[model samples]
Target: PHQIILLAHGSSDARWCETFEKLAEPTVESIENAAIAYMELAEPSLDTIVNRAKGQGVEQFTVVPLFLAAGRHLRKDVPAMIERLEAEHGVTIRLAEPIGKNPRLGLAIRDVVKEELERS
Candidate 1:
């Protein structure tokens, strides 16, 4: 089985965590093995999620960062973490590109701004 992990940069604020959870709600409903995980400062770290999935007989993982771009955490920290997890679990973990890199994101932002401007 495969697990899809939506990785977010967690904050101490519970509301911050809630936002990501709500964002991932649809995915969680649609995907049988989908989950949200925190990078830090929150419950259910990436390792914890991976371990849980592994225990459930999950053999592969796809980690999609909720980040806007490739920063230090994405470029350095996340890859290193994936390497360790893969070796430890004996499972393949694929790191996908951040949401910002997608062209549709720009269009979505543009539409939002245009809609707000119309309301103003």
Candidate 2:
């Protein structure tokens, strides 16, 4: 098994990662060989993390993009970038469709709202 690298969407707001980590880090760390990396407008860019994984002997990887929709990045950018990296580096990278269009998202949102309201 190579590694499970979660690809996150970046935010200009510095607290974004902190908040997300507070919610997700434990579960993510619990997964065997699972790690996290981010995409544009942030640190730990895909290229940087991939290189780190390479240094760590990651011959293959699975990238799960954390995004809300399947827009240009989903349809175009990410695949193109991965293809470029594959050619440049000889690492095998595979992409998985996001939690694509499902009612579960709605439930998640309602849960968030409930949690926030509880805090207040």
Candidate 3:
């Protein structure tokens, strides 16, 4: 099974975490082994989630940043963290470009807005 990790910045509000957990449900159901991790202010850090996935005998994993844009976390923290993980565990890790950089994302968002505009 391919392990997938969706990394997002954590928030203090319980609703924030709850919402994200719910959002990840579909991905979880579709993928054999999928998990979410927080950058800060949450329970499990990115490393923790990866460790658990590794415990399940995973040798390779894909990390998708849930952030909307490229900033300090994506540019600095994520790579630094992944470097350590790969070095320690000897597992191959693939990091996807942040969601904001994905060309299709704007189209997806526009579709949602387009539906609302039609309703109005």
Candidate 4:
């Protein structure tokens, strides 16, 4: 089983963590070994999560960034961090594109809006 990390920009606000925790629910069923990690301003940092996965003997990862767009965090920071982690831990990491770049995401957002409208 591949260890998956749902990576996100960190926040000190409780709501931000709550939102991420809710989002992480599906992973419990969809993935065998999965976790949520933050870059900063949050507990359980990316390094911590990766180390936990490593301790479980997971050397491969699918890092899904929670950002809607592929900003510097995805292009620059993520690659740089992953490179270091890969070298240090001898692991392979696959970085997925941001959610906004995915065509299907637009449709899903539209669907949610449509549902809300009908409910209203």
Q: Tens digit of lDDT per residue, candidate 3, span 1-120?
A: 468898888899999999988877888788777888888899778778777877888878889988779776469878888888899877889988887789888998999999999999
Q: Count of backbone clashes for each model?
A: 0, 0, 0, 0
lDDT of each: 0.89, 0.75, 0.84, 0.83
lDDT of 4: 0.83
lDDT of 2 by residue, 1-120 (tens): 487777777777889987656655875769876766777787777788778878888879888766667786467988887788777778999987664455677799999999999999
Off by over 4 Å in 4: none
Error of 4 at 87 (Å): 1.9
Which of 1 and 4 is ahead in lDDT? 1
C-alpha RMSD (angstroms) for model 4:
1.7
Better of 2 and 3 by TM-score: 3
Candidate 2: how large is its RMSD? 2.7
Candidate 1 regions exceeding 4 Å error are none
Q: Model 3 scores what on Cα lDDT?
A: 0.84
Which residue pairs of candidate 3 clash? Answer: none
Which tens-of-lDDT digit does each residue in 26-100 have in candidate 4?
875687777888888997887887788888888889888888887554688788988898898788999887667
Which parts of model 3 have CA positions greater than 4 angstroms off?
A: none
Q: What are the RMSD figures for all models against the true structure?
A: 1.4, 2.7, 1.8, 1.7
- Which candidate number maximizes TM-score? 1
Give lDDT: candidate 4, residue 64.
84
